[PDB]
mmCIF file of C-alpha atoms in Angstrom:
data_model
loop_
_atom_site.group_PDB
_atom_site.id
_atom_site.type_symbol
_atom_site.label_atom_id
_atom_site.label_comp_id
_atom_site.label_asym_id
_atom_site.label_seq_id
_atom_site.Cartn_x
_atom_site.Cartn_y
_atom_site.Cartn_z
ATOM 1 C CA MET Q 6 148.904 192.096 39.008
ATOM 2 C CA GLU Q 7 146.217 191.807 41.538
ATOM 3 C CA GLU Q 8 145.869 187.831 40.859
ATOM 4 C CA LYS Q 9 149.246 187.163 42.492
ATOM 5 C CA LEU Q 10 147.653 190.311 45.322
ATOM 6 C CA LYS Q 11 145.154 188.164 45.949
ATOM 7 C CA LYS Q 12 147.502 186.078 48.057
ATOM 8 C CA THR Q 13 150.546 188.877 48.404
ATOM 9 C CA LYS Q 14 150.567 191.972 50.407
ATOM 10 C CA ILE Q 15 150.119 195.826 49.873
ATOM 11 C CA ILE Q 16 151.385 198.676 51.541
ATOM 12 C CA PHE Q 17 149.954 202.317 50.951
ATOM 13 C CA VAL Q 18 151.346 204.992 52.929
ATOM 14 C CA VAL Q 19 149.228 207.615 54.301
ATOM 15 C CA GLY Q 20 150.184 210.671 55.754
ATOM 16 C CA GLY Q 21 151.174 214.372 55.930
ATOM 17 C CA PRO Q 22 154.923 217.125 55.176
ATOM 18 C CA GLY Q 23 156.687 216.863 57.617
ATOM 19 C CA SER Q 24 155.791 214.339 58.756
ATOM 20 C CA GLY Q 25 158.434 211.876 58.429
ATOM 21 C CA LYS Q 26 156.759 208.484 56.176
ATOM 22 C CA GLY Q 27 159.050 209.214 53.538
ATOM 23 C CA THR Q 28 162.077 207.820 55.942
ATOM 24 C CA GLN Q 29 160.187 204.916 57.898
ATOM 25 C CA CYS Q 30 158.547 203.939 54.058
ATOM 26 C CA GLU Q 31 161.866 204.110 52.810
ATOM 27 C CA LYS Q 32 164.431 201.697 55.067
ATOM 28 C CA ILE Q 33 161.809 199.466 54.804
ATOM 29 C CA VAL Q 34 162.592 198.295 51.413
ATOM 30 C CA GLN Q 35 165.807 199.456 52.232
ATOM 31 C CA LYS Q 36 166.854 197.024 55.515
ATOM 32 C CA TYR Q 37 163.735 194.841 55.154
ATOM 33 C CA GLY Q 38 164.221 194.588 51.080
ATOM 34 C CA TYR Q 39 160.700 195.066 51.316
ATOM 35 C CA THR Q 40 158.986 195.811 47.502
ATOM 36 C CA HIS Q 41 159.588 199.757 47.228
ATOM 37 C CA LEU Q 42 156.619 201.572 45.417
ATOM 38 C CA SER Q 43 157.089 205.579 45.108
ATOM 39 C CA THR Q 44 154.375 207.823 43.945
ATOM 40 C CA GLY Q 45 157.181 209.789 42.974
ATOM 41 C CA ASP Q 46 158.663 207.000 40.743
ATOM 42 C CA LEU Q 47 155.330 205.794 39.955
ATOM 43 C CA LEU Q 48 154.337 208.970 38.230
ATOM 44 C CA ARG Q 49 158.362 210.114 36.917
ATOM 45 C CA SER Q 50 157.892 207.401 34.426
ATOM 46 C CA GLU Q 51 155.038 210.316 33.342
ATOM 47 C CA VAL Q 52 156.752 213.190 33.659
ATOM 48 C CA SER Q 53 159.513 211.484 31.968
ATOM 49 C CA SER Q 54 157.869 212.576 28.839
ATOM 50 C CA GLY Q 55 157.897 216.902 29.717
ATOM 51 C CA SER Q 56 154.900 217.186 28.919
ATOM 52 C CA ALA Q 57 152.417 219.922 30.704
ATOM 53 C CA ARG Q 58 151.659 216.960 32.887
ATOM 54 C CA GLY Q 59 155.408 216.736 33.582
ATOM 55 C CA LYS Q 60 155.516 220.408 34.580
ATOM 56 C CA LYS Q 61 153.111 219.743 36.795
ATOM 57 C CA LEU Q 62 153.205 216.204 38.856
ATOM 58 C CA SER Q 63 156.756 216.008 38.429
ATOM 59 C CA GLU Q 64 157.066 219.343 41.468
ATOM 60 C CA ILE Q 65 153.878 217.922 43.307
ATOM 61 C CA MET Q 66 155.827 215.112 43.595
ATOM 62 C CA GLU Q 67 158.652 216.841 44.907
ATOM 63 C CA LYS Q 68 157.171 218.741 47.551
ATOM 64 C CA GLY Q 69 155.064 215.708 48.094
ATOM 65 C CA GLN Q 70 151.553 217.519 47.007
ATOM 66 C CA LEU Q 71 148.085 217.050 46.069
ATOM 67 C CA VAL Q 72 148.788 214.053 44.281
ATOM 68 C CA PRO Q 73 145.914 212.803 41.228
ATOM 69 C CA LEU Q 74 145.068 209.072 41.530
ATOM 70 C CA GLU Q 75 144.707 210.115 37.488
ATOM 71 C CA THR Q 76 148.131 209.217 37.203
ATOM 72 C CA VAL Q 77 149.199 208.096 40.556
ATOM 73 C CA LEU Q 78 146.825 205.038 41.155
ATOM 74 C CA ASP Q 79 147.384 204.578 37.031
ATOM 75 C CA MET Q 80 151.147 203.976 37.054
ATOM 76 C CA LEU Q 81 150.831 202.469 40.720
ATOM 77 C CA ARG Q 82 149.442 199.873 38.614
ATOM 78 C CA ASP Q 83 151.956 199.958 35.893
ATOM 79 C CA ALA Q 84 154.979 199.763 38.558
ATOM 80 C CA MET Q 85 152.306 196.990 40.722
ATOM 81 C CA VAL Q 86 152.699 194.426 38.031
ATOM 82 C CA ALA Q 87 156.478 195.095 38.298
ATOM 83 C CA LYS Q 88 157.007 192.423 40.976
ATOM 84 C CA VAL Q 89 153.655 190.314 41.811
ATOM 85 C CA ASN Q 90 155.321 187.968 40.643
ATOM 86 C CA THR Q 91 157.785 187.447 43.058
ATOM 87 C CA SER Q 92 156.709 190.373 45.302
ATOM 88 C CA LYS Q 93 154.715 188.886 48.486
ATOM 89 C CA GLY Q 94 154.302 192.665 50.006
ATOM 90 C CA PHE Q 95 154.452 196.053 48.698
ATOM 91 C CA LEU Q 96 155.348 199.473 49.809
ATOM 92 C CA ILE Q 97 153.924 202.649 48.375
ATOM 93 C CA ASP Q 98 155.024 205.823 49.794
ATOM 94 C CA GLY Q 99 153.214 209.129 49.470
ATOM 95 C CA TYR Q 100 149.281 207.969 48.683
ATOM 96 C CA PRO Q 101 146.564 209.941 48.926
ATOM 97 C CA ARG Q 102 144.302 211.045 51.621
ATOM 98 C CA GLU Q 103 140.951 211.315 50.431
ATOM 99 C CA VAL Q 104 138.740 208.576 49.335
ATOM 100 C CA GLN Q 105 137.897 209.563 45.942
ATOM 101 C CA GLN Q 106 141.689 208.705 45.232
ATOM 102 C CA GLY Q 107 141.232 205.241 47.417
ATOM 103 C CA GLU Q 108 138.303 204.049 45.019
ATOM 104 C CA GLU Q 109 140.106 203.689 41.626
ATOM 105 C CA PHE Q 110 142.903 202.437 43.040
ATOM 106 C CA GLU Q 111 141.628 199.024 44.479
ATOM 107 C CA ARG Q 112 140.594 199.394 40.672
ATOM 108 C CA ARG Q 113 143.717 199.797 39.148
ATOM 109 C CA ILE Q 114 146.423 198.288 42.156
ATOM 110 C CA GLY Q 115 144.283 195.829 43.471
ATOM 111 C CA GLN Q 116 142.638 195.987 47.350
ATOM 112 C CA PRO Q 117 143.592 197.143 50.839
ATOM 113 C CA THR Q 118 146.151 194.671 52.316
ATOM 114 C CA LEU Q 119 148.070 197.245 54.255
ATOM 115 C CA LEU Q 120 148.193 201.079 55.370
ATOM 116 C CA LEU Q 121 151.255 203.071 57.374
ATOM 117 C CA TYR Q 122 148.982 206.521 58.093
ATOM 118 C CA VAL Q 123 152.205 208.290 59.536
ATOM 119 C CA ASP Q 124 150.298 210.872 61.618
ATOM 120 C CA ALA Q 125 151.983 213.832 63.247
ATOM 121 C CA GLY Q 126 150.794 216.593 65.758
ATOM 122 C CA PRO Q 127 148.992 219.498 64.532
ATOM 123 C CA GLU Q 128 151.388 222.389 66.076
ATOM 124 C CA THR Q 129 154.517 220.198 66.381
ATOM 125 C CA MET Q 130 154.938 219.665 62.686
ATOM 126 C CA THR Q 131 153.292 222.754 62.154
ATOM 127 C CA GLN Q 132 156.974 223.661 63.286
ATOM 128 C CA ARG Q 133 159.517 221.587 61.064
ATOM 129 C CA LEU Q 134 156.850 221.451 58.026
ATOM 130 C CA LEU Q 135 154.662 224.936 57.743
ATOM 131 C CA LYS Q 136 158.468 226.753 58.969
ATOM 132 C CA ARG Q 137 159.616 225.243 55.410
ATOM 133 C CA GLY Q 138 158.175 228.356 53.836
ATOM 134 C CA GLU Q 139 161.386 230.285 54.162
ATOM 135 C CA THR Q 140 163.254 227.706 52.489
ATOM 136 C CA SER Q 141 160.372 226.486 49.944
ATOM 137 C CA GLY Q 142 157.000 228.482 50.150
ATOM 138 C CA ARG Q 143 154.296 226.962 52.106
ATOM 139 C CA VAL Q 144 150.592 226.732 50.914
ATOM 140 C CA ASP Q 145 150.332 230.441 52.934
ATOM 141 C CA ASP Q 146 153.195 229.920 55.213
ATOM 142 C CA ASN Q 147 151.381 230.477 58.265
ATOM 143 C CA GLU Q 148 149.669 228.176 60.988
ATOM 144 C CA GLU Q 149 146.480 229.561 60.565
ATOM 145 C CA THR Q 150 146.120 228.712 57.316
ATOM 146 C CA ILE Q 151 147.827 225.476 58.695
ATOM 147 C CA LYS Q 152 144.563 224.777 60.868
ATOM 148 C CA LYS Q 153 142.256 226.065 58.480
ATOM 149 C CA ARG Q 154 143.652 222.960 56.020
ATOM 150 C CA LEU Q 155 144.792 220.392 58.831
ATOM 151 C CA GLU Q 156 141.101 219.984 58.572
ATOM 152 C CA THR Q 157 140.502 219.953 54.985
ATOM 153 C CA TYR Q 158 141.873 216.574 54.282
ATOM 154 C CA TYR Q 159 141.655 215.067 57.878
ATOM 155 C CA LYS Q 160 137.881 215.041 56.903
ATOM 156 C CA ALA Q 161 138.708 213.859 53.246
ATOM 157 C CA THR Q 162 140.383 211.375 55.135
ATOM 158 C CA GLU Q 163 137.950 210.701 57.907
ATOM 159 C CA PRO Q 164 136.397 207.927 55.077
ATOM 160 C CA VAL Q 165 139.461 206.594 53.370
ATOM 161 C CA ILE Q 166 140.920 205.246 56.367
ATOM 162 C CA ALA Q 167 137.371 203.738 57.796
ATOM 163 C CA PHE Q 168 137.020 202.141 54.237
ATOM 164 C CA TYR Q 169 140.627 200.549 54.827
ATOM 165 C CA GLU Q 170 139.941 199.802 58.859
ATOM 166 C CA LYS Q 171 136.751 197.809 56.664
ATOM 167 C CA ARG Q 172 139.369 195.368 55.736
ATOM 168 C CA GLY Q 173 141.443 196.044 59.354
ATOM 169 C CA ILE Q 174 144.307 196.952 57.092
ATOM 170 C CA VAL Q 175 145.200 200.960 58.078
ATOM 171 C CA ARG Q 176 147.874 201.220 60.648
ATOM 172 C CA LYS Q 177 148.321 204.565 61.848
ATOM 173 C CA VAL Q 178 151.303 206.251 63.139
ATOM 174 C CA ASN Q 179 152.382 208.871 65.280
ATOM 175 C CA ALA Q 180 155.186 210.505 63.396
ATOM 176 C CA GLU Q 181 155.525 213.903 65.157
ATOM 177 C CA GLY Q 182 158.677 214.608 64.219
ATOM 178 C CA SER Q 183 161.866 212.454 64.638
ATOM 179 C CA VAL Q 184 162.112 209.742 62.965
ATOM 180 C CA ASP Q 185 163.366 207.636 66.063
ATOM 181 C CA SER Q 186 160.445 208.103 67.791
ATOM 182 C CA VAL Q 187 158.113 207.062 64.979
ATOM 183 C CA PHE Q 188 160.180 203.804 64.269
ATOM 184 C CA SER Q 189 158.619 202.275 67.164
ATOM 185 C CA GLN Q 190 155.005 201.528 66.125
ATOM 186 C CA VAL Q 191 155.868 201.233 61.926
ATOM 187 C CA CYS Q 192 158.557 198.635 63.134
ATOM 188 C CA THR Q 193 155.346 196.530 64.691
ATOM 189 C CA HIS Q 194 153.438 197.028 61.711
ATOM 190 C CA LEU Q 195 156.514 195.855 59.189
ATOM 191 C CA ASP Q 196 156.280 192.576 62.074
ATOM 192 C CA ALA Q 197 152.604 192.119 60.823
ATOM 193 C CA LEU Q 198 152.513 193.628 58.126
ATOM 194 C CA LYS Q 199 151.804 189.884 56.513
#
């Protein structure tokens, strides 16, 4: 598992809803053949049971809502051991935004070798993201909450990223919307991902 990781690279890409990490983080494993780890399927294995867990998390992974490290980093490790044997690098998509969720990760998955932080504007993203409520149902369906919320995770994120800055592995990307523009930064990180 980690034994291979000590020499192998790993990527946990973080970001927000409507940012565009789900696009970039995929085409990477699809076009580059890089190993793919999604919290969607990683956690999926759990929800499959159909228990109260599959009731709550199953959707949390759909809308990309708050995922609990308990089920996230746990199945991620299970999903990690999958190819470390021949996997030179992993691509995780939809990673938490707080160290509380980061602490155990390094305990199950391994160590921070690379992280892609897909960033999105406050108002810009707020347009394609928050307005989603009309077709789904955002937090409060109003940019105000968007604001009061923007700082909730931003704070919780400062330490996470920071701790990853320690290893100089974090790699932020400007994805305030279209995946095309952001494709310019994320790519530069996939070339140096080593």
